[PDB]
Amino acid sequence: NLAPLPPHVPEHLVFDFDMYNPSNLSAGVQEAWAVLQESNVPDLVWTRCNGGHWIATRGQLIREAYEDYRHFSSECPFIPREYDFIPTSMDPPEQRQFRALANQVVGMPVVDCLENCIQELACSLIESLRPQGQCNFTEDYAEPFPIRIFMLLAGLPEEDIPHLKYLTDQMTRPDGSMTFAEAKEALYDYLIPIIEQRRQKPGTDAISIVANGQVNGRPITSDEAKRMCGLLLVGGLDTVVNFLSFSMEFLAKSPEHRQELIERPERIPAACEELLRRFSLVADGRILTSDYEFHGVQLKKGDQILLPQMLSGLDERENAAPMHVDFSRQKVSHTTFGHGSHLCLGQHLARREIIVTLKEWLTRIPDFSIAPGAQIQHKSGIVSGVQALPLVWDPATTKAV
Amino acid sequence: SKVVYVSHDGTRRELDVADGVSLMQAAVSNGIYDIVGDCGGSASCATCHVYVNEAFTDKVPAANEREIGMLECVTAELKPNSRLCCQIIMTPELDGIVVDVPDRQW
Ligand code: HEM
Ligand code: FES
């Protein structure tokens, strides 16, 4: 359904893309979105879908908009205009307070420190799967891995995983019992007592560190800590689950690429970057704080603009033959983790999860494919994704380390 | 090319940094944890602040307006040789560059 065209929007800029239901989604998610980058589509379009909003289609505009929070505010980062978590909706300077605190728990020093634990987690999961000759990767690995990482960082017991999976799944891939707000309230109900306990008796886990931290020169409030912890959980789940699934979907179909990495495991870090570019999956945006002319288009105060992280690396102006995966690309240009002051706090952690996943999987289960008869179903939205990923392999071609 | 990073407490570190790699990226990938690099290198945060050794300042390309603007938000003392090291791109010309890392980024 199509919102009436505001009269400040030129008719020749209307391209009614629906980011929740794009045409030709069976060609793939990134292929569906790349319709925005065909040669006749302008750099900046208006869609009448989802209330009406702008979309920037090219990397150059996406980057520039993300570098200018004065005009393009995070106060309303999601489309449609109708979720608290911190610091998603904050601009600097206040956002910097929460970046500093989050860095204490998912920053590069913690990620370097955790590398061996992360490898062990991955190996344990993969070794459990190896003899079975099949799995639904999305459920059997892609979700358990990052959630177990969180339980480890946050000092939370293994027995709570099912409950947290359930609530986080209702938030992001809703089966339709719970609304988003109900699911979020339940997540808060779980965190609140833990935060209170760890302010009264702190440990050295991530919830203790966030919950006894400082912002603006005073102790963080329990409610701020709750909103930060909720994002540190949901932010590393939806994206990692779906991104790992996209990547393994591709490797299941691509024997030469798999073989490159089996024979030359030193190329995995480069491959991770190239998969990050090809299978980019986030699309959020910003709200205009004032009337502003941008690239020959007059934007109005209050207009929302979609600045799809996904699109920058798919832009043929940024990477030749962008739909091709080339692990040897000389410069992999992308904004998969975003750009500007909100660039993903988890970016280091995410790369180590992807690299460890690829290294540990290919060393044990080098040869696998999509289950016969399956057709992989995709979803599009703020975080685009894979519904399920049935894989099969011959256990006789595997190896236990 | 060699890059030397000296911490506020005198800790010295040395890296071999490829042409085209920023001094931030190198620091963040090799355990120089007193450079944070929070924004990922777009002169959008001020957490890659360093003091470029005075023997190298005329070898290093000048800061652009975006960097100058962001340098106003550094939390440590802002000095004449303050730079955001994500804006410093390694070249054979800069072989041996010494940078002093300030006592805070946050
Ligand atoms: C492949 C994996 C991931 C991708 C593609 C990704 C992508 C992104 C993007 C594009 C943003 C910025 C959105 C914007 O500007 O509004 C973001 C923010 C964030 N990400 Fe990730 N992310 C990933 C993994 C993670 C993980 C592992 C964590 C773990 C803690 C995490 C935590 C966050 C947080 C806390 C923020 C908010 C940063 C801010 O608003 O200042 N992400 N992520
Ligand atoms: S890494 Fe953010 S300004 Fe340098």
**Kind and range of the H or E run holding A292:** strand A292-294
User: Which CATH number characterizes residue A57's domain?
Assistant: 1.10.630.10
Q: How was this structure determined?
A: X-ray
Residue B64, chain A, CB below 8 Å: the answer is no
Q: Do residues A399 and A297 touch, judged by C-beta distance below 8 A?
A: no
**Kind and range of the H or E run holding A194:** helix A180-200
Q: Give the ligand at the shortest distance from the Cα of B41.
A: 2
With a CB cutoff of 8 Å and minimum separation 6, the contacts of A179 are none
Number of domains present in the structure of chain B: 1
Kind of pairing, strands B49-52 and B82-84? antiparallel
Residue A115, chain B, CB below 8 Å: the answer is no
Question: What is the spatial distance between Cα A198 and Cα A194, in angstroms, rounded to a whole number?
Answer: 6
Question: What is the spatial distance between Cα A280 and Cα A344, in angstroms, rounded to a whole number?
Answer: 13
Nearest alpha carbon to residue A77 among A263, A338, A257:
A338
Query: Was B73 annotated as part of a binding site?
Result: no
Q: Render A207-254 in DSSP notation, one character per residue.
A: HHHHHT-EETTEEPPHHHHHHHHHHHHHTTTHHHHHHHHHHHHHHHH-
**Domain span holding position A44:** 1-401
Write out the two tokens for A5. Answer: 């065209």
**Domain span holding position B98:** 1-106
- Resolution (angstroms) equals 1.7
CA angle A46, A293, A283 (to 5 degrees): 45
Question: What is the spatial distance between Cα A136 and Cα A65, in angstroms, rounded to a whole number?
Answer: 38
Cβ-Cβ contacts under 8 Å, B89 against chain A: none
If 0-12 CB within 10 Å is exposed, 13-18 middle and 19+ buried, where does residue A74 land? buried
Q: Do residues A15 and A41 touch, judged by C-beta distance below 8 A?
A: yes
Nearest atom in ligand 1 to the alpha carbon of residue A335 is: 10
User: Which CATH number characterizes residue B23's domain?
Assistant: 3.10.20.30
Write out the two tokens for A140. Answer: 């059997």
Q: Is B33 close to A108, i.e. CB distance below 8 A?
A: yes
Query: Was B85 annotated as part of a binding site?
Result: no
User: In three state form, how does the secondary structure of A90-155 look?
Assistant: CCCCHHHHHHHHHHHHHCHHHHHHHHHHHHHHHHHHHHHHHHHCEEEHHHHHHCHHHHHHHHHHHC
Question: What is the spatial distance between Cα A87 and Cα A298, in angstroms, rounded to a whole number?
Answer: 29
Phi, psi of A156 (to 5 degrees): -115, 145
Question: What is the spatial distance between Cα A188 and Cα A226, in angstroms, rounded to a whole number?
Answer: 7
Write out the two tokens for A71. Answer: 């005009």
Question: What is the spatial distance between Cα A47 and Cα A22, in angstroms, rounded to a whole number?
Answer: 12
Number of domains present in the structure of chain A: 1
What is the dihedral angle through the alpha carbons of A217, A346, A57, A288, rounded to the nearest 10 degrees? -20
Kind of pairing, strands A385-386 and A378-379? antiparallel
Kind of pairing, strands B82-84 and A390-392? unpaired
The whole-angstrom distance between B8's CA and the closest CA on chain A is 18
Q: How many CA atoms lie within 13 A of A388 on its CB side?
A: 7
Write out the two tokens for A47. Answer: 């869609």
